[model samples]
Target: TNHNLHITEKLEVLAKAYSVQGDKWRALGYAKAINALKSFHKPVTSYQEACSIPGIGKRMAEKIIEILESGHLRKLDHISESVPVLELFSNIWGAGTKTAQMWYQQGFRSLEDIRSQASLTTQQAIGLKHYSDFLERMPREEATEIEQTVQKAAQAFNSGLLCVACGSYRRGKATCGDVDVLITHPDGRSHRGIFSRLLDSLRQEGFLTDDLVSQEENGQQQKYLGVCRLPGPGRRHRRLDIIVVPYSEFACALLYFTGSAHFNRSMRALAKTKGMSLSEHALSTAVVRNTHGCKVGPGRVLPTPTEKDVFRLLGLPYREPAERDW
Candidate 1:
């Protein structure tokens, strides 16, 4: 649970505001401080107490102390003449800080302004349509409902199909930013055409509400990014991402997608130290990278049929999904 939601919540807004203003470094700094605050168990007591956290500096500590003293942060209002507006635009799916900044540069001020004056990609248009629904995180129960929906669809296509909902749901978070469902088939050949067919089935069922990147091909993986909702009344539109991979790469796929991003970074770092490379695609040893960190050679791709196999191959203890929330 977040021990400092009152503080982190404000910081989150600041981060997003800075993000859209093109002050990316400061935005990331706030992200680091927010993560530190969430992991810290106690209510912040003093300037010294807030400063004591490794990720938090004196400047951030002052902000926290201000938050403790007053109910809000004035920097928020001071920094946010367009901060809220920028933050709001950036919240659109497929729109990042760059897109949001460009929109601001074009002098479009609000969602209604964007709707009328801005040229949006199909993805951005749908994101705008469900702005409020897509912005909020869904309770774990709703995520499970979505996950089950996808899994059952896959099963009907082929009983041998393996499907899992990864991301924060797999990380055991109380809520999820979206549903990330990973698919593969143990028999290998069965997964070839399932991507399009499965999505078609979901759309036919009125489960998939909108399409973003409908078919993204990544090496042996096929992906879909879209919006979906359950069949019941009052069901809110939610973001859904689906990826289909070759069965041979299932373990690597699982490890990468079932991530707390910091934990993924650590694992990849550990691999490099051993002269190896790790990714959503595969794990390779005796790897070489150019000065620019591009791979000099393809390296040896090891067989990893299970997540446990990956851990042992890297000479590390296996971490449960919950344990990787670093």
Candidate 2:
């Protein structure tokens, strides 16, 4: 039996639809089934075959058979048509399922309706303004150019500054939904005060277009979310996330940010099972828990100077960034 790319892909769309509709449990079920299908050695040719796989129940197996025969999921199509406006409105950066449902109930039908009739927060307004552009994923080449521009600016401030593009780009995707740049320095102390300086330089060069969340500081890490565009004719505004962190946190931060999100969740779950906790900031071991769902003892942080170090601490084989998409 070979992999059934066709069935897995169709289920992924249905899973996303369930997520946007706020059916998280259903979405999780679909995601689990999709992952199971991905790892199955043979294509699922019948409902019984699908059912034999873990995570795929009777009803889910029926849907898989339908997809195998019809090349699409009718349930997804019906759901999409039922709430066509939900997807559109929820795409706004600050809006969620609740907000989309609220707008729909208010009789808002189009972007123009949201512009004139619906109340918008600052972030949502910016999201609406660049809705079309933000929806377009940038080619890997364009993302690289954007990263290079930031790297050059960072080097001007401090010649030894380290800048790495995370997210889907680091995972080697052909196109990226957004650009996430992680900044640090080999000398941890030098990273301090560089966040604002680097941002000011980018703004001075007119590379930054609009501020979304502005500057947010958490301990030794500072984050900036905004819009930026390369200076040229016909350039479109793109979402950019900048994070400046001390070198001490570089490995954990890199692993957290250079994720497909799903992989991070699985990693975190695995850490919990091992009586530990993993996050963007640090990995803690010897965590103590109680049946009452309380952390009896906050564990000690582990030293992780590199991504490989974190994997070693977790007793896992190191996976390259490109191999972490799962």
TM-score per candidate:
0.77, 0.76
Clashes of 2: 1
lDDT string for model 2 (100-183, tens) is: 767876778789999989898888999998998896668898899999999999999899999999998999978888999999
Off by over 4 Å in 2: 1-82, 290-296
Q: RMSD for all candidates, in order, please.
A: 8.4, 8.5
Pick the lDDT winner.
1
Candidate 1 lDDT, 30-142, residue by residue in tens: 99999999998897867778878999964568667755564422333343455466567877988865577678767777899999899988889898899989977789999
For candidate 1, give the lDDT: 0.83
Task: Tell me how far the alpha carbon of residue 234 in candidate 2 is from the true structure, in angstroms, after superposition.
Answer: 2.5
Q: Which predicted model would earn the best TM-score?
A: 1
Cα-based lDDT for every prediction: 0.83, 0.82
Itemize residue pairs with steric clashes in candidate 2: 1-42
